[PDB]
Amino acid sequence: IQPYKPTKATIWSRADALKVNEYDPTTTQPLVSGDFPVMSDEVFIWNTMPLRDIDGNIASVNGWSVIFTLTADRNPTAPEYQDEQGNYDITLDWNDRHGRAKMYFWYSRTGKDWIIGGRVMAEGVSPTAREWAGTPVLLNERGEIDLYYTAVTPGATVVKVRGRVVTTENGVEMVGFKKVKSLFEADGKMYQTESQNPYWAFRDPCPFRDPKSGKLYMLFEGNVAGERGSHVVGPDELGDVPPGYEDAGNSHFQTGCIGIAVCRDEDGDDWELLPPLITAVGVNDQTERPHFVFQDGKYYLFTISHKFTYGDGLTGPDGVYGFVSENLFGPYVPLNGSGLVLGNPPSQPYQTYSHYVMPNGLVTSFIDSVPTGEDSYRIGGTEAPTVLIKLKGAQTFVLEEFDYGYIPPMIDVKVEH
Ligand SMILES: OC[C@H]1O[C@@](CO)(O[C@H]2O[C@H](CO)[C@@H](O)[C@H](O)[C@H]2O)[C@@H](O)[C@@H]1O
């Protein structure tokens, strides 16, 4: 026997979070311009999910780049959104997007200047009221796609639906996305359930083939199992805090984690829940959109979070956080010492969200709210400038800003059926 250290969750501790620097130019997203363009006058988009293979390669099909988006109608004539002076209030319409979210696709031969394709699933196919985020996995040269996503209301369930991409020289269609398959939901012993917490998270599936083992796994956002308010911020969750920083306040209410599941097959059909990879009890309630970059034989695990979901006595920016390990199952250490990879600038703290770090170092995000004066701001619901980062050991560095919604392919796949 060669003994191995057992697998354990990596704790993102309060002491790690005290290192978060909101004023580091190497980990700050470039300022979004108040004059940003808007990709649709009919729909809002936000969370953007590039088509990719199971290994994480961003994929074009017959030269066409393809993105999936969470999407909501714009409702400029809705009486519910007219203010006291009878004028449309975009903020109310934008805030209601989550309750009416659906998957759309878009396409382009340039990786930008996206052409709208419309809804992925026809009316009546989705079993739930909302479609929340996931991953569109291109399977083969027949153009078959498994769309892994979150079916929300009733419950929050990781699901998948099989369909096919078809291209012509004029554009792209998504066909046959007809049968949604339940994969798993929160269990209550490892991941928190709605019964334990009405505000539980269980979302954002990110399937991948492990480059070392070749086995199929899947990341997702969850909360650490247990009744809301029952968790304890003990010595390990506090970590090595300095003198005067021992008070955890009511931070036991913040219980985010990055979960992982394993597949029993190569087809992503039958999944088993594993214990969490990263836990943030006392630190942040929302470790959203977990995803990997594999580089230099290491595992770079990114997650998106909010200023507002930090534990009592802690703060940091909205944006990208992340961790690195030599091994899929850890131990992970926080990137840049704190975990912060790409924070919104404090002057425009909500300019972007739902970032996605691609293996080529490009980070795509959508525009949320951009200030245009002392009291005034613009709503986006459209793609932000892409920005290049470099991963180097346990450091990251912001390098270069690219065009709005720039998502170039890493591979092209020849599709015929
Ligand atoms: O629209 C749901 C989708 O959005 C993400 C990121 O944009 O999470 C956002 O929406 C959640 C539901 O309202 C919020 O709880 C969360 O705070 C917010 O960031 C995804 O994580 C999710 O699939």
TrEMBL record:
Higher taxonomy: Bacteria, Pseudomonadati, Pseudomonadota, Gammaproteobacteria, Enterobacterales
Top class in the EC scheme: transferase
Keyword Transferase appears in the UniProt entry: yes
Keyword annotations: Glycosyltransferase, Transferase
Keyword Glycosyltransferase set for record: yes
Protein name: Levansucrase
Superkingdom: Bacteria
EC number: 2.4.1.10
